[PDB]
Amino acid sequence: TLNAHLTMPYVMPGDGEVVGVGEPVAIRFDENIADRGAAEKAIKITTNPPVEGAFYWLNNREVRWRPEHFWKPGTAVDVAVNTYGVDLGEGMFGEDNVQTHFTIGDEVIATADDNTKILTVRVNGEVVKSMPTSMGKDSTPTANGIYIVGSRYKHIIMDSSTYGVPVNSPNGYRTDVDWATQISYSGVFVHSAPWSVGAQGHTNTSHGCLNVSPSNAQWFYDHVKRGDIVEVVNTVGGTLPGIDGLGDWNIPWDQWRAGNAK
């Protein structure tokens, strides 16, 4: 048992971490898993207060577990990945066992409504921040749906080629931003956008990201943690895919619950 041929599992979140109410347990293997039923069997999750949940695979090497609804603040979760030498199919076995313990913090849900161009942040049901925002313009719109907060960066470059769009092309970009909080693997961030403050609250001008003001982006970066929720509604976009990496809550319970072990 470590705390967070042969496949190593890697489990998230990390040991003792405090995460938001949208955080799934993630188990990721460094090899494709032929026998998902077996991987699932080998993973034991305990919650306090107890709550029902279920596994769903986002791809061939990574499985997720979450309840039906967002976690209750204060819940404590223990994850025991008992895979050492377990038959994982096609002559691959677990390299080791792994475990983690984490807790759920405050309920933090930020809702970006394209009808108002306001991103409103709610802590335990109390509006604590209202941020004018400027989202994806019509030709490169922001997808509707529930996004899980992922990592955060004081400064990074977002480069469109990372997502299959050349920098040189009409929808391309290579952009330095401050106070960048990632909310989808497909490239959506809430981040500082001093170049669209006139538009924020009025007009969509971005490639998909939630532009807010320098001090609202910094506030968001300071007060939000991995697992918190950004709900986007009413854009002319599609829906964020359930298998994004941070889209898990867009898969309806009945479909999630049934799983996809085979």
Active-site position among 69, 101, 155, 191: 191
Give the residue among 130, 123, 129, 145 at the shortest CA–CA distance from 208. 145
- Report the CATH number that the domain containing residue 150 is assigned in CATH: 2.40.440.10
- Which single residue is written with the structure tokens 């009025």? 202
Catalytic site residue 69?
Answer: no
Same domain, 112 and 86: no
Task: Check which CATH number belongs to the domain holding 49 and give it.
Answer: 2.60.40.3710
Same domain, 260 and 165: no
Judge if 147 and 234 occupy the same domain: yes
Q: Are residues 81 and 115 in the same domain?
A: no
Distance CA 261, CA 36 (A): 5
Looking at the fold, whether 28 and 140 belong to one and the same domain comes out as no
Binding site annotation covers 138? no
Q: How do beta strands 9-12 and 2-3 pair?
A: unpaired
Number of domains the chain is built from: 2
Tell me: do 188 and 240 sit in the same domain. yes
52 is in an annotated binding site: no
Alpha-carbon span 37 to 198, nearest angstrom: 53
Domain assignment of residue 113, given as a range:
106-247
Residue with tokens 């984490």: 102
Within this chain, do residues 54 and 176 fall inside the same structural domain, yes or no? Answer: no
Residues 146 and 85 occupy one common structural domain: no
- Side-chain-side CA neighbours of 222 within 13 Å: the count stands at 7
Separation between Cα atoms, residue 5 and residue 184, nearest integer Å: 33
Q: Is 90 annotated as a binding residue?
A: yes
* Choice among 5, 207, 209, 223 that is catalytic: 209
Is the same domain home to 208 and 133? yes
Is 68 flagged in the annotation as binding?
no
113 CB neighbour count, 10 Å cutoff: 16
Assign residue 204 a region (left: φ > 0; alpha: ψ between -120 and 50; beta: otherwise). beta
Q: Which helix (H) or strand (E) holds 220?
A: helix 214-223
| Separation between Cα atoms, residue 254 and residue 96, nearest integer Å | 32
Q: How far, CA to CA in Å, does 148 sit from each of 124, 208, 253?
A: 17, 16, 16
Backbone torsions φ then ψ of 183, nearest 5 degrees: -130, 0
Residue 221 assigned as binding residue: no
Whether 202 is a known active-site residue: answer no
Same domain membership, residue 232 and residue 133: yes
Closest CA to 80 of 104, 97, 66: 97
Residue 137 sits in the same domain as residue 192? yes
Same domain, 116 and 227: yes
Do the Cβ atoms of 110 and 121 come closer than 8 Å? yes
User: Taking CA 210 as the corner, what is the angle to CA 204 and CA 211, rounded to the nearest 5 degrees?
Assistant: 75
164 is in an annotated binding site: no
The answer to whether the Cα torsion of 18, 19, 25, 28 is positive or negative is negative
Of 138, 217, 149, give the one whose Cα is nearest residue 178. 217
